[PDB]
């Protein structure tokens with residue numbers, strides 16, 4: 001159920017995603033997730049619900065359902081906080097909201113720095129994202145100070161291409177290698193080259209949007225829909241599982257961590273019931289064959305940033 005990180009800690013391979021979970025419902029989702037066995041929760045300041053996630057963890061600690069040491073809590077440094085002088089503050093905001101004294105894992109959320117300010121997505125008069133003049137290495141160094149201060153046990157990156165990861169690995173005077181690279185990954189975006197790269201460097205990959213993010217706010221009706229793909233439904237039916245269950249078990253058999261999101265109690269329980277079956281060799285091969293290089297997260301508004309990650313092949 002856990003994968004060994006390069007800081008000596010073990011990370012639960014199945015976690016709960018919290019992007020688009022309203023504060024209205026996320027407290028309940030987390031409480032239930034913890035009741036049915038989740039120990040990993042994936043969070044972010046930009047998700048605007050960390051207080052409410054905090055509320056649920058604190059209550060379950062107090063109910064004596066779980067202890068802190070058994071929980072693996074992940075958050076992410078948003079783009080507007082890449083300046084080295086802003087990083088600790090941003091982490092401590094997250095810590096305070098979550099009502100925690102440490103994070104198990106803190107990620108650079110995107111490789112791209114945006115103009116610091118109140119707005120999460122600063123756009124100019126004409127809709128282009130306004131970048132900041134930060135660079136990956138300076139931001140990484142700032143992430144390193146958080147480990148050395150005991151605020152976070154591990155640090156990592158998200159949405160970095162293999163050259164951006166290589167930049168960090170080759171940093172003269174590097175203090176900590178990234179532990180995790182969290183990237184979009186599912187049968188329509190199978191990431192074979194970037195996964196092979198990361199795992200060859202002892203960097204654990206976390207798969208996000210594993211169900212295709214049907215609730216992503218820019219969805220178009222003509223877009224491919226993983227959960228409704230009849231080819232996947234057919235794999236599911238043969239195993240007497242749901243398509244979500246197939247889609248969650250798929251990265252697990254690639255030695256990935258996976259973080260499906262739900263606020264629906266029934267689905268939170270369903271999604272965790274994936275350690276009682278296996279996908280066969282043909283199933284895995286079949287699912288990888290559905291790759292189309294289609295991304296949930298890849299906005300036109302960011303494509304001119306110097307650090308945009310998705311120009312490179314991988």
Ligand SMILES: NC(=O)c1ccc[n+]([C@@H]2O[C@H](COP(=O)([O-])OP(=O)(O)OC[C@H]3O[C@@H](n4cnc5c(N)ncnc54)[C@H](OP(=O)(O)O)[C@@H]3O)[C@@H](O)[C@H]2O)c1
Pocket residue numbers: 016017018019020042043109158159182183207208209210211212213214215227242244245259260261262263264267268270271297
């Ligand atoms: N690092 C980054 O840049 C980044 C980017 C995107 C996502 N992430 C993380 O990855 C997590 C997962 O990705 P995601 O939120 O984009 O989407 P996802 O997990 O692929 O899909 C979530 C959608 O699927 C529905 N769903 C969940 N379980 C289901 C089931 N058993 N049957 C049918 N529908 C089900 C959910 O509905 P209900 O909730 O209404 O039940 C929701 O609409 C995020 O929440 C976030 O923590 C990180």
Ligand SMILES: O=C(O)Cc1nn(Cc2nc3cc(C(F)(F)F)ccc3s2)c(=O)c2ccccc12
Pocket residue numbers: 019044046047079109110111112159296297298299302303305307308309310
């Ligand atoms: O961030 C999440 O976890 C989910 C997420 N994704 N996206 C699509 C994005 N695509 C990006 C692309 C870059 C890029 F690096 F590529 F330029 C940088 C930043 C972003 S945000 C959003 O617009 C968003 C808005 C609010 C809360 C969460 C999200």
